[PDB]
Amino acid sequence: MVDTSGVKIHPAVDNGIKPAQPGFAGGTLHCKCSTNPVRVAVRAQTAHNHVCGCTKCWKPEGAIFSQVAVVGRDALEVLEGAEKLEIVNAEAPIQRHRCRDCGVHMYGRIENRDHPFYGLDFVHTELSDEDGWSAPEFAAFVSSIIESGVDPSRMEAIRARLRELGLEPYDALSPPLMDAIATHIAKRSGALAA
């Protein structure tokens, strides 16, 4: 029915989704600087890798979606180049740490102890040379790619291409992630027991 040729999502998925390696123990993330790069050690497997359509997160050059996963924050350590890192917005509830010279977000931290995603850093595993990272599971904030200049009439083919890659399109997070967030909110507010 729908014509899916020439639709690009993110280069990590354009030729199909790479599998995780069982027993993957982590690796290293590097910014894009030819010299004195920021290096971050990710000392665990990631979870919930997905492509993301929101305007706030780092995409490679010419990419409509970003690819972003989560790791427990104890697993993260800036190896080299911490001086080179600046926060993209200190007001943002997830605080993006970006390299000063190439503009590459090395991680995103939640400093709010009450935020649902607290304890978990947000990393772009494409910044690693090693394969075997947690595979992209879904597409998030899909309708928000329009806010970066994607033409609405392109949306049918984008979603049809996401689905053929196996990445279910959502206009928020995946349903299990959204129930996780609502449960956290409800436990904080007293709507739910605990």
By Cβ distance, which residue is nearest to Zn ion?
57
Kindly provide the b/e burial profile for residues 102-123, where b requires at least 16 CB atoms within 10 angstroms of the residue's own CB: eebbbbbbbeeeeebbeebbbb
User: Is 160 one of the binding residues for a second copy (CB under 8 A)?
Assistant: no
Q: Is 52 annotated as a binding residue?
A: yes
In the set 155, 157, 163, 168, which binds a second copy (CB under 8 A)? 155
Q: Whole-angstrom Cα distance, residue 176 to residue 150?
A: 27
In the chain, the largest separation of any two C-alpha atoms, in whole Å, equals: 52
Is 146 an interacting residue with respect to a second copy (CB under 8 A)? yes
Asked if residue 7 belongs to a known ligand binding site, the reply is no
Active site residue 42: no
Q: Which of residues 83, 159, 163, 165 is near a second copy by CB under 8 A?
A: 159
Which one of Zn ion, a second copy, none interacts with residue 57, CB within 5 to 8 A by kind? Zn ion
Is residue 143 close enough to count as binding a second copy by CB under 8 A? yes
Distance (Å, whole) CA 9 – CA 13? 7
Strands 138-140 and 47-52: what pairing? parallel
54 is in an annotated binding site: yes
Annotation-wise, does 63 bind a ligand? no
| 54 given a catalytic annotation | yes
In the chain, which ranges are continuous DSSP H helix?
A: 11-14, 155-165, 175-189
Give the C-alpha separation, 32 to 84, whole Å.
12
Catalytic residue among 13, 40, 42, 52: 52
* Options 13-21, 32-40, 98-106, 140-148: segment touching a second copy (CB under 8 A): 140-148
Please indicate if the annotation marks 102 as binding a ligand: yes
**Which of 151, 160, 165, 167: binder of a second copy (CB under 8 A)?**
151
Breaks in the chain (C–N beyond 2.5 Å) sit after none
* DSSP calls for 121-132: EEE-GGGSS---
| 57 has catalytic annotation | yes
Please list the active-site residues: 52, 54, 57
Binding residues for Zn(2+): 31, 33, 52, 54, 57, 99, 102
Q: Which residues bind a second copy (CB under 8 A)?
A: 142-149, 151-152, 155, 159, 169-173, 175, 178-179, 181-183, 185-186, 189, 191-192
